[PDB]
Amino acid sequence: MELYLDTSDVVAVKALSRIFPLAGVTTNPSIIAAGKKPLDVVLPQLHEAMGGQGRLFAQVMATTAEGMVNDALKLRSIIADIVVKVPVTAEGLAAIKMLKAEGIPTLGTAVYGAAQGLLSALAGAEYVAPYVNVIDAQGGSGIQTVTDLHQLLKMHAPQAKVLAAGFKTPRQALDCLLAGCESITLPLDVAQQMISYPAVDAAVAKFEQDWQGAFGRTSIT
Amino acid sequence: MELYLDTSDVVAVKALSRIFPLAGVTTNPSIIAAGKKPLDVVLPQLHEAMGGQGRLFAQVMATTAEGMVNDALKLRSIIADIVVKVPVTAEGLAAIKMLKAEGIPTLGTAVYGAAQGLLSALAGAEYVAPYVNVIDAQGGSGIQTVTDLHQLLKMHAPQAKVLAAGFKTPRQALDCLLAGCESITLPLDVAQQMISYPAVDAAVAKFEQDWQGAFGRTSI
Amino acid sequence: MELYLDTSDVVAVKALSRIFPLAGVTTNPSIIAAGKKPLDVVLPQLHEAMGGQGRLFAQVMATTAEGMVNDALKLRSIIADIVVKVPVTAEGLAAIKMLKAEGIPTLGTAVYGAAQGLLSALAGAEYVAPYVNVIDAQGGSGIQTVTDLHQLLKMHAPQAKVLAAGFKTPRQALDCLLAGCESITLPLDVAQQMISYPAVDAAVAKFEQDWQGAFGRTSIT
Amino acid sequence: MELYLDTSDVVAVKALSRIFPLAGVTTNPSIIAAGKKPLDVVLPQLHEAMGGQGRLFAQVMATTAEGMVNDALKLRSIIADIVVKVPVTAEGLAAIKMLKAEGIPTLGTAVYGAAQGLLSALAGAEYVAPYVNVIDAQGGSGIQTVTDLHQLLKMHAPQAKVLAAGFKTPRQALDCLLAGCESITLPLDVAQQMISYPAVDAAVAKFEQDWQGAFGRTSI
Amino acid sequence: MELYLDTSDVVAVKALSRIFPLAGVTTNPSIIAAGKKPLDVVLPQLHEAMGGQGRLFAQVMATTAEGMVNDALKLRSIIADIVVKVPVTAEGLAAIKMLKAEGIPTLGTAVYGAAQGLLSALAGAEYVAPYVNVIDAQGGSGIQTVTDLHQLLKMHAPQAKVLAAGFKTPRQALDCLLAGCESITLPLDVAQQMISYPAVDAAVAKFEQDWQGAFGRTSI
Amino acid sequence: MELYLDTSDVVAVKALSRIFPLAGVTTNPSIIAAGKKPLDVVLPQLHEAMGGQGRLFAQVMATTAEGMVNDALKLRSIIADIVVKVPVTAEGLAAIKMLKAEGIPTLGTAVYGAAQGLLSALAGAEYVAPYVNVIDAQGGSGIQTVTDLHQLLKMHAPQAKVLAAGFKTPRQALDCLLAGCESITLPLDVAQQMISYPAVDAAVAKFEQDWQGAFGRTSIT
Amino acid sequence: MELYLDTSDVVAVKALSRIFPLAGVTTNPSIIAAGKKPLDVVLPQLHEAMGGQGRLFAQVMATTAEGMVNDALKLRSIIADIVVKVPVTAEGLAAIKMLKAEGIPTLGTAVYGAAQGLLSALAGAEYVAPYVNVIDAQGGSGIQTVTDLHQLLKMHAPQAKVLAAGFKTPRQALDCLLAGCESITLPLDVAQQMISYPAVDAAVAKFEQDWQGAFGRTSIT
Amino acid sequence: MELYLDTSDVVAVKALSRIFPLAGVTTNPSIIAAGKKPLDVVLPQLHEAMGGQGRLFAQVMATTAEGMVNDALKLRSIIADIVVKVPVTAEGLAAIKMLKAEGIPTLGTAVYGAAQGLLSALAGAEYVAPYVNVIDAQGGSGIQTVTDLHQLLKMHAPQAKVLAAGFKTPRQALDCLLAGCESITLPLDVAQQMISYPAVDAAVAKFEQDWQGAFGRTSI
Amino acid sequence: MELYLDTSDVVAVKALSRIFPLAGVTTNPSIIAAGKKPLDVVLPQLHEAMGGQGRLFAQVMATTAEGMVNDALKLRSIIADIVVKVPVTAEGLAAIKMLKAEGIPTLGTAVYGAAQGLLSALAGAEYVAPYVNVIDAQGGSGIQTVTDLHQLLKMHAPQAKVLAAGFKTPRQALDCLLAGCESITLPLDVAQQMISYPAVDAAVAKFEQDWQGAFGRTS
């Protein structure tokens, strides 16, 4: 199991790497755009903010296979071991095949369907990222798509893992983990909700009160 | 897992071999007939259009076992490593048994039933091809037949795989893959629908707009 | 239960109305475009080809609610009792609400989601038409969407029916009918496959042979 | 619920009408052909052999709707209240529609699929007869087809009933009855197996022995 | 719901009628034989031992329909409102049909199968009695047979009820009641186990101890 | 079925009342606080923005039953037919009982459990509002709680309905509607996502192109 | 998996051994009686009609264990490697135990119950043959009994296999194979129905017509 | 699987050891009491009646752990390899722990609950014996308890097996075997019912008649 | 499978260690507070009351990770091999990560959610303790949470076990054991109910009566 943060926010990655067991950080174009720092600045910073270990993901922007391969080589010169995210289109699949030949790890992104996702794995991607909340929001079922996709990868492309992406609620992350996803990437608001519960804070308060009212302090000797 | 295109269209095989991870191409008599080129012309062309790698399948035409074995030897002289498709009839099963003895890979085709399909595997076929959409269309369930057939092969003939064939919609291909089929063959219209989605195109458009409105270009 | 043909083909409607128990004919813009005859020509012809009984459906083209209401009034002047098809968008829903006020039957079309479909029913549509094969083809499940939509209509909008639309195989039509759809519309290729079976033809052949080989003819006296 | 015998055997109908609660007798062309007596002879005999009460079913032979309607009028002149069996084809459906207009009860026969069966009900048939064992034998599931068909009739054509037909084993008849079929037609070998059990005969023997060994006879 | 005791033991019927809400008493030949008293003695005694209210059941002994009808008329002259138990055989069904015509309530007994049971209901029986423990013991499932039979009666013969019979354990009686049987008949050993529990006796003991240790007595 | 918007945003209520078939608008303290306008200003504005038809909901602030009853009487003097939202606590239940006696419709809010929710219905509330996303976020299942709550109301308090509240995704609203909720209240971001789909926009575009390429315009005559 | 024919018909065994992959032939007393040829004639003929390869099964007639062991020794002198069919009764089980001691393969036949069948396996039988159609016909479920029996053998007697016997329809054979039976024996009428389908014949006809109407023949060069 | 008889009846053990594949014989206090012969007489007789092969089980009578350990040592001096039955109480568990230390195989008996049964396995028992019919009779479910107990043993104490005990019907024995119990112990009435079926006797009769009517004898 | 008692009651631990196969004893702050004896007194007593064998668990009190690590080192100086219970909060997870680095076994406690519990296992905890009755009582399902948590640990953190905690009834303990928990900790009232049954006592009585009425003694 591989826990990823889904952010370009360097400060928050350094803070949360003390708390969560992070395998790394995932980016997409919208998340880099929101940060307003370009790739040759933010990727090295993100790499340094996890202490120079663990995996980064960034997306190609080009529309053609030849262009997506050049975008990949550009990303690999910024971060030597980066995994190249490639959207799963006709041109996407062709790029994933070429990138397998050159030996550059890829991830099939913008997956809205299990069949689509499996094709990217068979083409050579070692991660496949269905956009859970987007499928959910566009009238379908993100959990069904992730469940189906994980089953397909485990029978037909065992070398590949689902990297479940795009969460508005922790329930979505839990249902993906229960369906068997070997990797997931949390936005910062969902990661926060996953570790801070009112019910737990009340349990800790009561433990302090009971320890106080019996030993006159709230600490150990 | 083995992805096959179900076509005699040489141009489309060359285009799509750049995109899909193809294990090869399947033919039947109707698909060769539609192409209007005979087997000694189209098979070598199809072989060359996937870069000389991966498997071809072509069907015997004869009515008797002895005749189906001769049809097989003719196909093997056109393509040395071709897999012979044999319809699963009384005479079909007898040919599959004879072809196992000679050591020529076969596929049991025109399978409308799980029991029928298993007999072809036990006889020696290493692929079994239920006609999914035809079972579906003729009042039955292609998915139930493929599901049952895959279970039967995995318990009673582990040497054999389902090669699910005959799709009008990508859902049918997905349900066969989810039921565990280790091979499938897509017609060109279904393969196209499986890789091009409006929702994905909109996601890519939005990524370009966001990157534009923050860095002033759409590239790196 | 209401069986509809999904065609502008006047000749085939007259042929098949002798065979199928037709409640009428559904059209969309693409189906009218393929026929190359405009609405004021083809609709009266389609109406005459079912013997001047039964329901017609045709789609508005406008982008605004006010425009969709005018498109509706134009359709009602061609066929007095036509049901107006309205795509289920923001502007679509607003038009359906206005058309309920004026008392013009509407159908919520271009439905890719159960929630979307229910909103069109609550707005006033008395038919809701999920595009079964399109949902199926775009990585989702048409049967799940139709099943969910029918459940929603039966709990929350009992005045409305699912009119399942868009079939590449008869199995899809059967699964919609089994999920409880009170209306369906078949393209001509699927309707043909639903009534002609090789296995049935062989059963009839054998009945003729047995009757021949015992009474010397293939007819009754 | 309506129990039918599926036979032209007049002697066996008279014997079994004493035992089973029969609603009548069903015929098909093959069953009349086997009997070698024509319709104007055997139908009145079958009607008399159930004591002139309950329903008869016989099949049209013609290929066109107009021809199937004439075949129907011929059957109605032999037996005034007969139900006309019509195979569910393009021409079949057209005949069923015409026969509804004239007010002659019909049954949609030779049904190998649920969708097919529902169309015959919507067209006007008040019975629909899926050939259970034939679907079962031709690689499909007769029970699935009957179950689906009954569900379809109850939602979309409540005026119609399934008349399940074609049994090689009593299990098939039980599974159709459990799936909710409001009518069924048994061949003579299956009807016999449904009422005679070794286990029951042993229970009756033991009751006689216990009554003997306590009162010195086996009666009251 | 109708609770019956399955015994000829007059003393035990009078004791248990004070405790259970009895609808009556069922007999079979083996149970009358064990009691060693003949029908014209024991039936009036059993009727009196439930205070002259509620239903009795007794079984015919004859092998032929005409004989089973005479056995029925003999039982009706002993107890005017008795329900005639008839084993479900060829001859059984014919007798049930004749007994419906004469207007004498019957019960189809010695039922080892759901289809068998339904035929007896369609023939006119208003009770059907599958031998639960015997089906269970002879390698099958009494609960499955009772469940199937109850479903069949509720769809196809609503006039009839299952009277589940033959229990070695209270679980069997509970599973029949949960499957929906509107009548059941308990042997004395099972009825006893259904009302006396160690856990309940311990609960009552503890209530007495708590009341003692607070008020100094065990009464009010 | 009763569709509610969950907002104090008067402008957006007037825009969306043209589109959705609204039964009214729900408020809570946090939603009124965000709007920065007090109750005697915003409630009459919200009432006018749905054209003076359909229901409003607002929450009491007090800690005691007697105080919650006074808060209710204050709300009823601002909007004569308002439904009083009461949090389901010890004091909450006591207020709901008193408010039933006086004949003022109430809603049991801040429901994190099915048992809790049923007690508010038995006490006299005619709506019960489980906080779906909050239960989901705090490690539980909002859908399970809503499903259980709806079953409980239908067996044990048939006079009451679930008013499902608090959504981050339209899937959550769909699963509540499928579980049988006879009322729901959508925040503006979820309501928007429920009516606008990329797949539908593409279908409408293609209909315009086909009609263009056959009749030379994109409108009807 | 082991396919057996259930017949004494020597001619039909030789015809069908060309088509089916036969592991051998099963007999019972009724099937030998119908053939009217005694065991010392028909068994060697049946052995020769499958080309002298694969297994034969024949049934003992005796009522006592000592008698069933003698019947076994008589069968083994006709066919050296024959499997002895023993009905599963008190005396049957005792014979199976004795035959295990002497090292003669046995099959527990006339099995109407899963418990009965398991006892024969534990006693030493390496095949157990529930009479599927007879259980089905006598008011029970052959499929349930075979399913239960196969589960029991796989947990409690892994040395043994179900040899499902007695079919009136191919569905019964399919349901036994789907429940996991590692061996089955088909009567000739069921074996025929399992390989000849009208729908397949129509598919082959259409292939010939298409090949004809494009190359002017129905053969390959 | 280990098949056990649940009896002190030496004659019946010798008869049935010829028929059933017995792993041995189980006793309890009530079963020894019914036999009226004490342990030092009946156990060696039972051991000899299965030909001096396979396992015996007998129960301790003492109330305290120290007493149950002495009872165990007494049983081991009568039969060297006997398995000691210990009721699963507070004192029971303590004895099982002590008996594991000394190296004497034990069985946790009088188990009415899955949790109770698991504790006896964790304490060191290598068999756990839920009283199936008693749980069933006292308003609960013996099958549920055995199913749960077997699951618990397989996850949390793999060294231990369920020895299902206490049957009034063969269905109960079958449901325990289907739930996965690796050992079971049958009373004589249930063991008899498990091997003698009327339906099988009729099948054998018919085989004799067919062989007679074709060869003139009933032998080879 | 690892059976734990959930108590600071030294006398009851010594009594019940004769009966149950105990892997050790778990403590929390409230349970130590109720006992009124501090950790440096009660922990060595609890260790001695199970005969110096099997595991002890005690909870940190501090609010910060650095403070929770110091609390851990204090516990390890009282009992060398103790497992440090750590509540699963932001600061909790950070402490669990630091304690994995130093090589001190930890348990993620105060778990009210499956996702929460899995994070503590991924962080390095080798036990995770959902508060079953508290989840049950606060409107949720303890059995669902334990079932989900066990599934998550077995797929994503196989190094870790569920230690199900907080029971008001033996059914709750059974449903956790059936869902596959490889460890559990029983309060004394539930442990007692799990071994003493009226129905069993009646069965033993009847065995004595039958043996009496046939051999004239109860030996």
Curated annotation (Swiss-Prot), chains B, D, E, H:
Q: Which InterPro entries match?
A: Aldolase_TIM, F6P_aldolase, TAL/FSA, Transaldolase_3B/F6P_aldolase, Transaldolase_AS, TSA/FSA_arc/bac
Reactions performed catalytically: beta-D-fructose 6-phosphate = dihydroxyacetone + D-glyceraldehyde 3-phosphate
- What does the UniProt entry say about where the protein is found? Cytoplasm
The keyword Signal appears for this protein: no
Alphabetically ordered keywords of this record:
Carbohydrate metabolism, Cytoplasm, Lyase, Schiff base
| Lyase in keyword set | yes
What's this one used for in biotech?
Answer: Is an interesting tool in chemoenzymatic synthesis for the construction of chiral complex polyhydroxylated sugar-type structures. The use of hydroxyacetone (acetol) as a donor compound allows access to various 1-deoxysugars. Can also be used for the synthesis of a broad range of iminocyclitols, that are potent glycosidase and glycosyltransferase inhibitors, from dihydroxyacetone, hydroxyacetone or 1-hydroxy-butan-2-one as donor substrate, and a range of acceptor substrates.
What are this entry's molecular-function GO terms?
fructose 6-phosphate aldolase activity; identical protein binding
The record's note on activity versus temperature states: Displays a broad temperature optimum and is active in the range from 20 to 75 degrees Celsius. Although no significant loss of activity is detected after 600 hours of incubation at 45 degrees Celsius (at pH 8.0), the respective half-lives of the enzyme are 200 hours at 55 degrees Celsius, 30 hours at 65 degrees Celsius, and 16 hours at 75 degrees Celsius.
Activity across pH: Optimum pH is about 8.5. Active from pH 6 to 12.
Enzyme Commission number(s) from the entry: 4.1.2.-
Q: Which GO terms describe its cellular component?
A: cytoplasm
Q: List the disulfide bonds.
A: none
Q: What does UniProt give as the signal peptide span?
A: none
Which NCBIfam families does the UniProt entry name for this protein?
A: fsa_talC_mipB, PRK12653.1
- More details: Is not inhibited by EDTA which points to a metal-independent mode of action.
What is the protein name for this chain?
Answer: Fructose-6-phosphate aldolase 1
What's the source species for this entry?
Escherichia coli (strain K12)
